[PDB]
């Protein structure tokens, strides 16, 4: 994973996202959704999803939430006050903690001012608590600003490492982007059915035809502009549409 003071930032993009494999995986110790309850994720579409990743203590997972305070949310990773995404977290004691202490997971414990939301700060300047200038050397009131979790496998829960992923769905002003899956089914012929091809919605009886579209053409229509043929998006075969008998 990535440190807590330099989190990662992956920009998930146009894709088919299935938040159900996440939501029901039961391996997550914390799955909170804020802008939107979890079950309705696989039924919405946004412009971008960002995923941030890092590793913290066990009992600092309650500062990854909109409107908190503490050494993590103050200056390591700040969530805006109208967050929209979801926060996922699971214990990882066996992967990240090693006998003798894993001193490779640091965090920032001194900063001039709390972070703006989603702001990031990887500098390593000597912090200056008192009024006396520091001149790049340590001493009283001149402190190195990074400390390290010394993780060890015999730590009580709440001191063992937890891995955290923060999904943030954003909606700028584009034309569209990633959304949740879309079902599908077999196709029966010679019966009055309710069909739906990609958004073409109607009812009638579908037969096989003797037309020949052009490779980019997706459905046909006649004079008076009624749909009388269609292409189905998996066989690449065109089908005649006939209204279901009436009188």
């Amino acid at each position, epitope marked *: 994973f990535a440190s807590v003071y330099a989190w990662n930032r992956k920009r998930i993009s146009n894709c088919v996202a299935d938040y159900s494999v996440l939501y029901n995986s039961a391996s997550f110790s914390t799955f909170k959704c804020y802008g939107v309850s979890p079950t309705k994720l696989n039924d919405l579409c946004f412009t971008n999803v960002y995923a941030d990743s890092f590793v913290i203590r066990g009992d600092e997972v309650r500062q990854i939430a909109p409107g908190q305070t*503490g*050494k993590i949310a103050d200056y390591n990773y700040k969530l805006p006050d109208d967050f929209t995404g979801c926060v996922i977290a699971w214990n990882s004691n066996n992967l990240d903690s090693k006998v003798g202490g894993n001193y490779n997971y640091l965090y920032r*414990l001194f900063r001039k001012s709390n972070l703006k939301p989603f702001e990031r700060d990887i500098s390593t300047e000597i912090y200056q608590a008192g009024s006396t200038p520091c001149n790049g*050397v*340590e*001493g*009283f009131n001149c*402190y*190195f600003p990074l*400390q390290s979790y010394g993780f060890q496998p015999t730590n009580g829960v709440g001191y063992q490492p937890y891995r955290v992923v923060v999904l943030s769905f954003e909606l700028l002003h584009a034309p569209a982007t990633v959304c949740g899956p879309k079902k599908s089914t077999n196709l029966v012929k010679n019966k009055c059915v309710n069909f739906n091809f990609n958004g073409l919605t109607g009812t009638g009886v579908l037969t096989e035809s003797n037309k020949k579209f052009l490779p980019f053409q997706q459905f046909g229509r006649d004079i008076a502009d009624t749909t009388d043929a269609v292409r189905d998006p998996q066989t690449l075969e065109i089908l005649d549409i006939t209204p279901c008998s009436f009188g």
Partner: antibody
Amino acid sequence: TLKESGPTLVKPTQTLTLTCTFSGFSLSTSGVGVGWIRQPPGKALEWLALIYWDDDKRYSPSLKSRLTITKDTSKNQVVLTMTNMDPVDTATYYCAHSLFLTVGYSSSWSPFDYWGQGTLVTVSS
Amino acid sequence: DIVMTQSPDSLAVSLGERATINCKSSQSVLYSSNNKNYLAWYQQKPGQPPKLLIYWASTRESGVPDRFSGSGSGTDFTLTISSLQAEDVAVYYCQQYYSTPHTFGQGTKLEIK
């Protein structure tokens, strides 16, 4: 793992080096030091001198004139020379290993963390 | 200057019993930029130096029994030693770097009843 080596009975007014021989750690990385302490009998303790990783030396302002420290990361020691012996300095002389002065709101310098043992000093002719 | 006034002097605590020592700093010694107290408890064995028992007032040192544990708030600072063993005939200290001079606890007689 510190240990303060030194002579046991002293005579007045002369300068006196002092050796806190340690091991188990070095003494030149950002966040490390060793503070030197005395305590006369019945009194509370008195830290005397200190030196950090890039040799940031501290002393008591009263015997700033007489205390003169230097760290020995190589020997895992610290040399502190100290002048003007007098019988009210009849103390046993300690060293204590500083670590991450970010924690520094807990001890009044009196202690620290490591701490060796101490070489006794008595002022008698 | 923030004087550290101990709790129980000639403590006649029985064997295996909760021995209590309070420390009353005269001022609130909390560095509020930590959300965590600092205090260093110490054990002078007679003829021996005081050794660090609990730093951060909640983070016990290595190799130390967890039957000793630290507590306290604001200006009152207690010590939750749950059991007084036969090894506990010693002298004890509490202090604060959150000051200027060498403030001190005064030291307690640990008679084992």
